[PDB]
Amino acid sequence: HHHHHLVPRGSNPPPPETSNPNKPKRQTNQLQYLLRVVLKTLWKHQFAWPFQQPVDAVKLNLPDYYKIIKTPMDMGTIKKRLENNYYWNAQECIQDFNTMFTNCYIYNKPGDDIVLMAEALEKLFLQKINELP
Numbered sequence: 542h543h544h545h546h547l548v549p550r551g552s553n554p555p556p557p558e559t560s561n562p563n564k565p566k567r568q569t570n571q572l573q574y575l576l577r578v579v580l581k582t583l584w585k586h587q588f589a590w591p592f593q594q595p596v597d598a599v600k601l602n603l604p605d606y607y608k609i610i611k612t613p614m615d616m617g618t619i620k621k622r623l624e625n626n627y628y629w630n631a632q633e634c635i636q637d638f639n640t641m642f643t644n645c646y647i648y649n650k651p652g653d654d655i656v657l658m659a660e661a662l663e664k665l666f667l668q669k670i671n672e673l674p
């Protein structure tokens with residue numbers, strides 16, 4: 542038989558939502574600090590780049606990624622959520638950062654470069670969080 546299963550192909554899942562008109566939202570001093578201080582400092586860090594967009598499993602040749610990671614999150618998504626006033630409180634935003642870091646630790650192993658990057662960003666995150674208003 543001449544069907545060699547070369548199609549259909551893989552793909553990335555749809556990215557996490559950054560808008561949801563029926564979701565409850567507020568502006569708070571804690572959320573303004575999360576955008577102004579926490580996000581924007583991590584975003585400029587030299588270790589930010591792997592976390593600035595959803596994991597592109599096709600481009601990065603990580604065909605197992607979305608087999609393993611079922612609640613993806615990234616800083617591009619968090620940044621859009623903060624700019625769009627998506628959140629109701631600081632906790633919702635902090636949980637997204639926690640998810641992002643945890644996903645990296647789940648997928649990879651201690652001492653991997655990507656894990657070193659996440660650990661460093663997480664340390665900076667936890668420092669900035671300790672001065673939340």
Ligand SMILES: COc1ccc(Br)cc1S(=O)(=O)Nc1cc2c(C)noc2cc1OCC(=O)NCCN1CCOCC1
Nearest residue numbers: 591592595596601602603644645648649653654655656658
């Ligand atoms: C080799 O890829 C990387 C190595 C160090 C770093 Br810092 C970043 C990358 S990457 O190109 O951004 N890929 C990559 C991204 C993420 C994110 C985001 N979270 O977890 C990740 C893991 C990543 O790469 C893991 C890795 O082992 N990639 C090579 C997989 N190879 C498998 C067989 O050979 C061809 C490709």
